[PDB]
Design an enzyme around this catalytic site. Structure first.
Site, PDB file in Angstrom:
ATOM      1  N   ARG A  27       0.850  -1.184   0.000  1.00  0.00           N
ATOM      2  CA  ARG A  27       0.000   0.000   0.000  1.00  0.00           C
ATOM      3  C   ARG A  27       0.890   1.240   0.000  1.00  0.00           C
ATOM      4  O   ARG A  27       1.767   1.379   0.860  1.00  0.00           O
ATOM      5  CB  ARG A  27      -0.931  -0.009   1.214  1.00  0.00           C
ATOM      6  CG  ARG A  27      -1.951   1.116   1.226  1.00  0.00           C
ATOM      7  CD  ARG A  27      -2.906   1.004   0.051  1.00  0.00           C
ATOM      8  NE  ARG A  27      -3.633  -0.261   0.059  1.00  0.00           N
ATOM      9  CZ  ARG A  27      -4.423  -0.672  -0.927  1.00  0.00           C
ATOM     10  NH1 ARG A  27      -4.587   0.082  -2.007  1.00  0.00           N
ATOM     11  NH2 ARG A  27      -5.044  -1.840  -0.835  1.00  0.00           N
ATOM     12  N   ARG A  28       0.653   2.140  -0.956  1.00  0.00           N
ATOM     13  CA  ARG A  28       1.598   3.221  -1.227  1.00  0.00           C
ATOM     14  C   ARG A  28       1.783   4.132  -0.019  1.00  0.00           C
ATOM     15  O   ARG A  28       2.915   4.463   0.354  1.00  0.00           O
ATOM     16  CB  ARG A  28       1.131   4.028  -2.440  1.00  0.00           C
ATOM     17  CG  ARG A  28       1.926   5.303  -2.702  1.00  0.00           C
ATOM     18  CD  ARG A  28       3.372   5.001  -3.078  1.00  0.00           C
ATOM     19  NE  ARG A  28       4.094   6.202  -3.488  1.00  0.00           N
ATOM     20  CZ  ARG A  28       4.789   6.978  -2.662  1.00  0.00           C
ATOM     21  NH1 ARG A  28       4.861   6.682  -1.372  1.00  0.00           N
ATOM     22  NH2 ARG A  28       5.411   8.054  -3.126  1.00  0.00           N
ATOM     23  N   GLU A  58      -3.664   5.840 -11.432  1.00  0.00           N
ATOM     24  CA  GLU A  58      -5.105   5.618 -11.321  1.00  0.00           C
ATOM     25  C   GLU A  58      -5.778   5.442 -12.676  1.00  0.00           C
ATOM     26  O   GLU A  58      -6.840   6.014 -12.933  1.00  0.00           O
ATOM     27  CB  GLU A  58      -5.736   6.765 -10.537  1.00  0.00           C
ATOM     28  CG  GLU A  58      -5.511   6.652  -9.039  1.00  0.00           C
ATOM     29  CD  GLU A  58      -5.874   7.915  -8.288  1.00  0.00           C
ATOM     30  OE1 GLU A  58      -6.414   8.851  -8.914  1.00  0.00           O
ATOM     31  OE2 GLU A  58      -5.612   7.970  -7.069  1.00  0.00           O
ATOM     32  N   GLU A  76      -3.671  -7.322  -7.686  1.00  0.00           N
ATOM     33  CA  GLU A  76      -2.418  -8.061  -7.570  1.00  0.00           C
ATOM     34  C   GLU A  76      -2.607  -9.347  -6.776  1.00  0.00           C
ATOM     35  O   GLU A  76      -2.103 -10.406  -7.167  1.00  0.00           O
ATOM     36  CB  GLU A  76      -1.348  -7.180  -6.924  1.00  0.00           C
ATOM     37  CG  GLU A  76      -0.910  -6.014  -7.793  1.00  0.00           C
ATOM     38  CD  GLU A  76      -0.075  -5.000  -7.039  1.00  0.00           C
ATOM     39  OE1 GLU A  76       0.103  -5.167  -5.816  1.00  0.00           O
ATOM     40  OE2 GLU A  76       0.400  -4.032  -7.667  1.00  0.00           O
TER      41      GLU A  76
HETATM   42 CL   LIG Z   1      -1.702   1.497  -3.334  1.00  0.00          CL
END
Ligand SMILES: [Cl-]
Length: 141
Positions: free
Chosen positions: A10-11, A40, A83
């Site tokens: 998670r970024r 996005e 993913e």
């Molecule tokens: Cl993300």
């Protein structure tokens, strides 16, 4: 395009740990792919992510709230969700890395990714990163 490891993360919460895992693995000669673009853009097909399919292992960085954006994502728009689904569909060896993460109940996750909760997680240790990395490498194929 077929590395040893794909790192999913998670970024906003797991960027530094995912990066630390990557370079640690590279120190041991493993090839690693990580997505730092995370644009996005829409993939309007139920398409398996090529980079996940090509990688021989799937490492999932479970930072705090890492799967929050996956909840109710039944249209499968979230990057991490797509993913994970690709890794499950391809029968990948999934190695979750735990860093202050609360395993949610399976009911709050979409059906196509609830199977990810059944894999053995490895807790990350800043004090013993080298020891943790060797354990991760033992879980790799
Ligand atoms: Cl993300």
């Amino acid at each position: 395009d077929t590395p040893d490891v794909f790192i999913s993360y998670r970024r906003n919460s797991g960027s530094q740990l995912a990066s630390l895992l990557k370079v640690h693995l590279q120190l041991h000669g493993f090839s690693v792919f990580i997505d730092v673009e995370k644009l996005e853009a829409p993939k309007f097909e139920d398409k398996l992510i090529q980079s996940v399919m090509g990688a021989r292992n799937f490492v999932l960085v479970l930072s705090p709230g890492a799967l929050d954006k996956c909840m109710q994502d039944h249209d499968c728009k979230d990057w991490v969700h797509k993913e994970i689904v690709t890794a499950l569909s391809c029968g990948k060896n999934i190695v979750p890395i735990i860093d202050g993460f609360e395993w949610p109940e399976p009911q709050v996750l979409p059906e196509d990714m609830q199977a990810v909760l059944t894999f053995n997680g490895i807790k990350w240790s800043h004090e013993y990163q080298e020891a943790t990395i060797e354990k991760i490498i033992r879980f790799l194929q």
